[PDB]
Ligand binder design. Structure first.
Ligand code: 4D6
Length: 265
């Protein structure tokens, strides 16, 4: 029979002029909401959350890695580096670069941290090591953002994103001190006020990571949500659209997140 849970998501994507992918897990009950959950969508800047987690994992066994100053020059800067552009002569620690990448989507900080892992291949290998077979990243900023329809490079699925997010924020993929730092970085994100955060009651807590490729209507958000009186919810909302000049929509992301939270048992 027709999937009645799915119908309002299909209407939402049709109104948007593209495709929406959603996965949500109630970690209390095991309930889920799923819509195109296993389809691939471009990661865009949402990869930077997993980047910071991979650096935290490395930091467990490399004493003082997170505390290490990185002295970079202007050759490291690229567009949308509002934090990094301020520390050319003072540097930033690995922890500070991680916070910038997570909480401001700083592009230069992301590329500096990719270098610490052995590039996009190194981050992909970390994701394989936690059991994520879907995540693919093979470019640096800005090239990973092209988001061309049918290109599986630099993509993941809403379900894989959510599964990996739960392992890293609530499960055992990081040691507790590192898990906690990842949570605190996500909670302090500044870029997501119009996406999943706009979908929750104001008294719920949220940690999230956004991404915006912009072209091909492509943008996303994933989050861990601590609802009043409930176990955490983990969810991912990704969008794409067929034409290069199609515009992404924050409001559509928020609307999809609301339907997920409503449908979720
Ligand atoms: B990233 O894909 O997304 C960031 C914004 C976000 O977290 O939602 C900005 C940096 C990356 N994108 C780009 O460099 C292109 C941009 C899109 C809108 C602002 S910059």
């Amino acid at each position: 029979l027709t999937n009645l849970v799915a119908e309002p998501f299909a209407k939402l994507e049709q109104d948007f002029g593209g495709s929406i992918g959603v996965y949500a897990m109630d970690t209390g009950s095991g309930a889920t909401v799923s819509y195109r959950a296993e389809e691939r969508f471009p990661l865009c800047s949402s990869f930077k959350g997993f980047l910071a987690a991979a650096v935290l994992a490395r930091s467990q066994q490399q004493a003082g890695l997170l505390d290490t100053p990185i002295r970079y020059g202007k050759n490291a800067l690229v567009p949308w580096s509002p934090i990094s552009e301020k520390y050319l002569t003072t540097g930033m620690t690995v922890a500070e670069l991680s916070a910038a990448a997570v909480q401001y989507s700083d592009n230069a900080a992301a590329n500096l941290l990719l270098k610490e892992l052995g590039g996009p291949a190194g981050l992909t290998a970390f994701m394989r090591s936690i059991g994520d077979t879907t995540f693919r990243l093979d470019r640096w900023e800005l090239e990973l953002n092209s988001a061309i329809p049918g290109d599986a490079r630099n993509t993941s699925s809403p379900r894989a994103v959510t599964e990996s997010l739960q392992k890293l924020t609530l499960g055992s993929a990081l040691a507790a001190p590192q898990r906690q730092q990842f949570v605190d970085w996500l909670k302090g994100n500044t870029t997501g006020n119009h996406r999943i955060r706009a979908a929750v009651p104001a008294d719920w807590a949220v940690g999230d990571k956004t991404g915006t490729c912009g072209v091909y209507g492509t943008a996303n958000d994933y989050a861990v949500v601590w609802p009043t009186g409930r176990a955490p919810i983990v969810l991912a909302v990704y969008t794409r659209a067929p034409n290069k000049d199609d515009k992404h929509s924050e409001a559509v992301i928020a609307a999809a997140a609301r339907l997920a939270l409503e449908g979720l048992g």
